[PDB]
From a paper:
Since late 2022, XBB* variants, especially XBB.1.5 and other XBB derivatives with a proline on residue 486 (486P) on the receptor-binding domain (RBD) of the virus Spike glycoprotein (S) started to dominate, which demonstrated enhanced binding to human ACE2 while maintaining extremely strong capability of evading humoral immunity. Interestingly, L455 and F456 are two adjacent residues on the receptor-binding motif (RBM) of SARS-CoV-2 RBD, and the variant is just the “flipping” of the two residues, L455-F456 to F455-L456, also known as the “FLip” mutant. These two sites are also located on a critical epitope that targeted by the public IGHV3-53/3-66 Class 1 NAbs. L455F caused strong affinity reduction on XBB.1.5, but significantly improved the hACE2-binding affinity of XBB.1.5+F456L. Both L455 and F456 are on the core of the RBD-hACE2 interface, forming a compact conformation with D30 and K31 on ACE2.
To elucidate the disparities in binding affinity between XBB.1.5, XBB.1.5+F456L, and XBB.1.5+L455F+F456L (“FLip”) spike proteins with ACE2, we determined the structures of these three spike proteins individually in complex with hACE2 to interrogate the conformational change on their RBD-ACE2 binding interface. As we expected, all three spike trimers mainly showed two ‘RBD-open’ and one ‘RBD-closed’ conformations with one or two ACE2 bound. To validate the hypothesis, we constructed recombinant RBD subunits of XBB.1.5, XBB.1.5+L455F, XBB.1.5+F456L, and XBB.1.5+L455F+F456L (“FLip”), and determined their binding affinities to hACE2 by surface plasmon resonance (SPR) assays. The dissociation equilibrium constants (KD) demonstrate 6.4 nM, 25 nM, 11 nM, and 2.0 nM for the four mutants, respectively.
Author numbering:
A (entry chain C): 734 to 782
B (entry chain G): 734 to 827, 850 to 1075
C (entry chain F): 978 to 1140
D (entry chain F): 295 to 618, 633 to 675, 690 to 733
Amino acid sequence: TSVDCTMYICGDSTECSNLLLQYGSFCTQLKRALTGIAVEQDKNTQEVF
Amino acid sequence: TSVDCTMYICGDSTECSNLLLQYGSFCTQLKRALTGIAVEQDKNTQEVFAQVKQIYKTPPIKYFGGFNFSQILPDPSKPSKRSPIEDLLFNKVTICAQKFNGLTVLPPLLTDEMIAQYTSALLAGTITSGWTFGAGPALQIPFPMQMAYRFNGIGVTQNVLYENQKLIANQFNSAIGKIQDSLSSTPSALGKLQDVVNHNAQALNTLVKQLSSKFGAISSVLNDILSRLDPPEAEVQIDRLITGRLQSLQTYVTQQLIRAAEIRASANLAATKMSECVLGQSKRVDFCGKGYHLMSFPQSAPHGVVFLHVTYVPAQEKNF
Amino acid sequence: NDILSRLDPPEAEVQIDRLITGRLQSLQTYVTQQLIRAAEIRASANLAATKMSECVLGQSKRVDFCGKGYHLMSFPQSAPHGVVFLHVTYVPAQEKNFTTAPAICHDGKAHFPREGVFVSNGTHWFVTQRNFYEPQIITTDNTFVSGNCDVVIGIVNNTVYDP
Amino acid sequence: PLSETKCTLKSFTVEKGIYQTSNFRVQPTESIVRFPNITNLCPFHEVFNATTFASVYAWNRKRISNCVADYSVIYNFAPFFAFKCYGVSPTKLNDLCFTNVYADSFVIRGNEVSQIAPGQTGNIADYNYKLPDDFTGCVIAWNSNKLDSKPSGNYNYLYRLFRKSKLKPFERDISTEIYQAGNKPCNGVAGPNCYSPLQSYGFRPTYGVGHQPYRVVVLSFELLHAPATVCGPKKSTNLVKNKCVNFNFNGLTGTGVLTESNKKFLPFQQFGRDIADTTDAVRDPQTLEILDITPCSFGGVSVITPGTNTSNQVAVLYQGVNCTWRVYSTGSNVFQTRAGCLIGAEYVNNSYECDIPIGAGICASYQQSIIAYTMSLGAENSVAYSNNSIAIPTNFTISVTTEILPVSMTK
């Protein structure tokens, strides 16, 4: 699974994304972690198959 | 690693500590969590390395049936007591401003010198005494005496070794010569330890850059707010910055407790392979490498271990 | 109880709103720590079940997996929220250093041990196994023959007996 | 520190091992404030006390250049009525330097004074005037009924309440302002809907309290900018070298030690923000000298002790802090392990089995004294190796060993 940072927390409104950027560096590690879980999860089939 | 809850959240301001103490009962748990992960992490290395309580040394003369092991035994002429393979593993693997925000790192209890001594003693035990030294006292056996019994463990009569020991010596020496250029050819093989290092590094970096954040406040600096506003007001700006930083601490240490779990499992698996692939000749297929396994060499590495598995595969066959 | 006796409920949610949240994050931290410890003790329980299956129901010849040294057999015992294993194992005590050879010349042909180590007291020659010293007389049924006396190093000229 | 350990562990007995306490955290010696020597008298009387100012429709938005002023010039007026301020509390508009002060003066009625507050709508906050609602600046109002009021009535002052389209904050709108509304083209000369956006005030000194002429000055500025424009007088003091000290360099402050120049910069480049986004290099406001800021070193204090049932002779260690240095007083012995400084313990060249770890292969044990020593790996052993020798054992023992494994914790 993967989840988008901006569109989930805020809809199609610019100022919610402007108010979103104050935390700023919070969803970057979330996206990195979901790509991580995706990549070792896809990797897990290789050593068993 | 270790954090100071007071210094990260607040500078040299008494009122920030006053608004911290009305929470009060949070960063003591942070302290116990960081001490727990510390005592868990530094305790991993003894069962990986100090499996033997009898340190050994190599004999000065090596009449090893024509074998060569100069690449893996430590070199006395080297200023460090390490093998050249240890030198390649060391230099092939690659702060103050990070430290200066109350973010301390603790040196390990075991440094490189005595873990190199552990690896050298393990090599000394597994060469001149076979595998019986993992049970009681070390029983000295000549190496071609031991390799015949290791062949017998894989259903091979000992006459094969005494017929083809010259070819075995040439093949093994050529393979050891090949493995140096194999390790030095690409750095993609060392990616299994760079990942832990830079994952720790970027997590610490994204922790320390979280201070400059507009967490519902006029400014992210704490001192200028004190020179800005009265003490009744702007507590509503202080406390939101407190919460936004302690939640960052919570997300950091939760990820750290996550990451320690597989590191402990990998260390346990490495200790199991230390027990099996080194102190014995396990017939479990693919557990000690690929194919029928003969024996293994351990070598230390920055925050890690590497194993040289010598195994056995047939080459030419005929139908009957 | 006192804060409802203290404040008009229009300003209650102005006041009693955030300690509910703080208790929520505290219990979330407790839950996350419980999951971490539960996963750790779950892995420990898997290891304990594996060693229960290996060390007890059979003679697991893996080294150090069921004790120290050569494992023989094991005793399981209960404990409050735990299990304890009593491993009975073997360990050699006294040893002597003897003179060996990998093969034996006799009548121009080479003799190899079917199973054991060749040893000698200095005058006679004998064979044992790899753990105890029981000298047996070198007999053609105690060994086997494959080839002659040129390809093998360390071989010594000796005699063998035929029943 | 044994009593501090009891205080931390909330028990009267501790058995062994390493523990944790607070840090050293050395204090700064003094504080250094550095100001440029250019200190003149900044004119504020021309906006405070003068002839009859204009109405609210005409703004005398004044740019105040580089000068030096304090609150003593402002303090000349006792009849200050609207002393309410935003951004900075009124007790500390001194000894801090802004970058661009925006002064605008007008004359309004008594009831229009409360309408200058941001985030509301009123007679002034309508189409006549729009203002930024963040409002880092402040509003200062004082009554002028003895000067602005006239016996014949001040009907000349006007205000543009009835402008058609919206105003944006900080905009200038002074023109003819023809009124074209209704479902008809007015053309300015029709007669049905030729409304006048400008109306008179009326000022005679027999009124109520809400119809008096009030001088209002409004200030709008911001902060966190490298140049400084105006602030109060402060005697600058010389800097110090290699000393834990507070510093204040025209606004932004800090605490640490200072180091000479090592880098080149660029002749309008004066700040030294690092990869950690912290200030660590700056130049003098009075001279062209690069100086480097490194904060005073922290501590990290840990305690080591034997059993409370055994003894009470303890020792402490400081992580990272070099002693060889700034550790106040000393004790019997000081040691300088790579893990850190250590006092309260002795050192030997011997080697014994470790009971409590410390760091970098150092362990402390109890003899009547606490002894710190290097790592002992075990009994040193060697076995002779020969081409034709076999070790063979004859006697043996059976041994029983224990293993303890957790299975489940309490549901």
